[PDB]
């Protein structure tokens, strides 16, 4: 009865999609995420999982502002200028 019989009672979910990390680990009762600790300001990450870090690091996403900072760097972040016109 601890097995196939009591696998039917599973109908109300514990977690939902966290809004900070988009993973299905937001404990609805504890009101905190198990993947990033969303209500806490600091993203949670431990060294004892060398691999769970490589899934969420500055390279894993779009870097929509870093891939441009890395380009504006090759010229000391010049500003307010344009090439000489034709």
């Amino acid at each position: 009865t601890k097995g196939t019989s009591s696998f039917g009672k599973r109908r109300n979910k514990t977690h939902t999609l966290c809004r900070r990390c988009g993973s299905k680990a937001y404990h609805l009762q504890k009101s905190t995420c198990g993947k990033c600790g969303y209500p806490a300001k600091r993203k949670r990450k431990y060294n004892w999982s060398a691999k769970a870090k490589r899934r969420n690091t500055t390279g894993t996403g779009r870097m929509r502002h870093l891939k441009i900072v890395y380009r504006r760097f090759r010229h000391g972040f010049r500003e307010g200028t344009t090439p000489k016109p034709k």
Partner: protein, 122 residues
């Protein structure tokens, strides 16, 4: 007619917003032709008009921003958009004058004991 961004810079704000409000109607009529079924000559003009609208709104925002940073050209406080945006640590430095500042004790040491240029005989 190929709408280039060059001949858009002399026109006036309302002589630009009339072109915008005409291109958006040409879009609406093309997104309608797409669903009613139209010739590819029309379907392929969507990429042409979406980019004509892009060129227009680009010249509008560029002239408006140039006018803004001219209006605040000599003022002390200016909008955080016109303030020079570099890296946060590069904006939180010391000025070139605070860097180039010296205490009266070191303006006196540098003066009384300058670094002399010399050589030695071998």
């Amino acid at each position: 007619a190929k709408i280039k961004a060059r001949d858009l810079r002399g026109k006036k704000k309302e002589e630009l917003l009339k072109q915008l409000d005409d291109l958006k109607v040409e879009l609406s009529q093309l997104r309608v032709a797409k669903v009613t079924g139209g010739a590819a000559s029309k379907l392929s003009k969507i990429r042409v008009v979406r980019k004509s609208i892009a060129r227009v709104l680009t010249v509008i925002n560029q002239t408006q921003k140039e006018n803004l940073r001219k209006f605040y050209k000599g003022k002390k406080y200016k909008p955080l958009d016109l303030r020079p945006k570099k890296t946060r640590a590069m904006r939180r430095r010391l000025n070139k004058h605070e860097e180039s500042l010296k205490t009266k004790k070191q303006q006196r040491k540098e003066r009384l004991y300058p670094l002399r240029k010399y050589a030695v005989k071998a």
